[PDB]
Nucleic acid binder design. Structure first.
Ligand SMILES: Nc1ncnc2c1ncn2[C@H]1C[C@H](O)[C@@H](COP(=O)(O)CP(=O)(O)OP(=O)(O)O)O1
Ligand SMILES: [Cl-]
Ligand SMILES: [Cl-]
Ligand SMILES: [Cl-]
Ligand SMILES: [Cl-]
Ligand SMILES: [Mg+2]
Ligand SMILES: [Mg+2]
Ligand code: NA
Ligand code: NA
Length: 326
DNA sequence: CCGACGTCGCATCAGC
DNA sequence: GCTGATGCGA
DNA sequence: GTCGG
């Protein structure tokens, strides 16, 4: 937080462009600038100094000058005033509610936490759960609780089958002292890019996690992805821990490295790494890295034996998880 | 200029 | 039932 | 909103 004020302004501007203007390009632009400015080792002194950083053009440079001189931004001040803007922005904070659904509700007269409760009937399952744990999902998870959560997951997974390998990724693997949620990468030798020797692989795990009452709710569930809710167990007379979001991703074992790279993120890092990949003639996803033909066509998977192999193909120095928090 | 700016799983809808 | 677009999220 | 060709 050397330039915490500036990166917050741009983040607010990004959230506004995405939730209200439904303009993700302006969204990505602001996110990028906030990112590049967040890793800047100096205390920005002007818009011009910031403009030297890639991603900060003229418009943002001007906005930075204003912020520095007054400690605020009029454009955002007005946005905070506007009731529709603030209402939409607010509703998008409910898990499962996006710009579209937010603007729809405000068009129907639903614009507060109270309005959502007395209209639960208009929400799909996901939105209902996001509302039910609204306060809870707004809280950060101390690493200490992440560790206890890690332990429960790995151990409950081992009990279903010793061959399952569960790895906690996301901001946790990047070393954050706190996380917004828990992300779990799962692998089993019975599921490779060549065949699915077993069914209900993710199910069995989710099932066991529910059995021990760790997983409390489900937001969505397929054969390789599970998005839900979990809660650490508490002591006698001890207050309950908040419910937490939990994501599970089953990836073909032979595609592990590509999978853990993806799931470690951050999201912006992935976008940048993948963008850079395309310029170097490759395309990367959570399964593989394939070379692109002159006609823009995904070639066949390339051999990968480590995360570092992916960075090499694109000619990037390897970067430790703790340095991929862009 | 001014067009390009990662990738994909699941829930839901419309159309058939 | 299906496919395919869209919303929302990882 | 910013960038490179
Ligand atoms: N838009 C996107 N494009 C590409 N990859 C994306 C992505 N959103 C999420 N990911 C990937 C990388 C995240 O680390 C990882 C976890 O997704 P996540 O939403 O849990 C965010 P995380 O980075 O874990 O921080 P935190 O706020 O949860 O503590 O999923
Ligand atoms: Cl846009
Ligand atoms: Cl402001
Ligand atoms: Cl891989
Ligand atoms: Cl692939
Ligand atoms: Mg996370
Ligand atoms: Mg997550
Ligand atoms: Na710049
Ligand atoms: Na939301």
């Amino acid at each position: 937080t050397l330039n915490g004020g500036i990166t917050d302004m741009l983040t607010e501007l990004a959230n506004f462009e995405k939730n209200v203007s439904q303009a993700i390009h302006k969204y990505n632009a602001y996110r990028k600038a906030a990112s590049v400015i967040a890793k800047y080792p100096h205390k920005i002194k002007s818009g011009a100094e910031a403009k030297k950083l890639p991603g900060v053009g003229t418009k943002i440079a001007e906005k930075i000058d204003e912020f520095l001189a007054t400690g605020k931004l009029r454009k955002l001040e007005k946005i905070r005033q506007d009731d529709t803007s603030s209402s939409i922005n607010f509703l998008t904070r409910v898990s499962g509610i996006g710009p579209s659904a937010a603007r729809k509700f405000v068009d129907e007269g639903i614009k507060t936490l109270e309005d959502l409760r007395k209209n639960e009937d208009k929400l799909n399952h996901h939105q209902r759960i996001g509302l039910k744990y609204f306060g809870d999902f707004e809280k950060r998870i101390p690493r200490e609780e992440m560790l206890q959560m890690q332990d429960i997951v790995l151990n409950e997974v081992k009990k279903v089958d010793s061959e399952y390998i569960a790895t906690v990724c996301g901001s946790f693997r990047r070393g954050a002292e706190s996380s917004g949620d828990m992300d779990v990468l799962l692998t089993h030798p019975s599921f490779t890019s060549e065949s699915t020797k077993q069914p209900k692989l993710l199910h069995q795990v989710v099932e066991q996690l529910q059995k021990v009452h760790f997983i409390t709710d489900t937001l969505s569930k397929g054969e390789t992805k599970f998005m839900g809710v979990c809660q650490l167990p508490s002591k006698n007379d001890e207050k309950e821990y908040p419910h937490r979001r939990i994501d599970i991703r089953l990836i073909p074992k032979d595609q592990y490295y590509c999978g853990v790279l993806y799931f470690t993120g951050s999201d912006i890092f992935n976008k940048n790494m993948r963008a850079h990949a395309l310029e170097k003639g490759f395309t990367i996803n959570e399964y593989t890295i394939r070379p692109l033909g002159v006609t823009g066509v995904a070639g066949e998977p390339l051999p990968v034996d480590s995360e570092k192999d992916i960075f090499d193909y694109i000619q990037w120095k390897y970067r430790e998880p703790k340095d991929r928090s862009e």
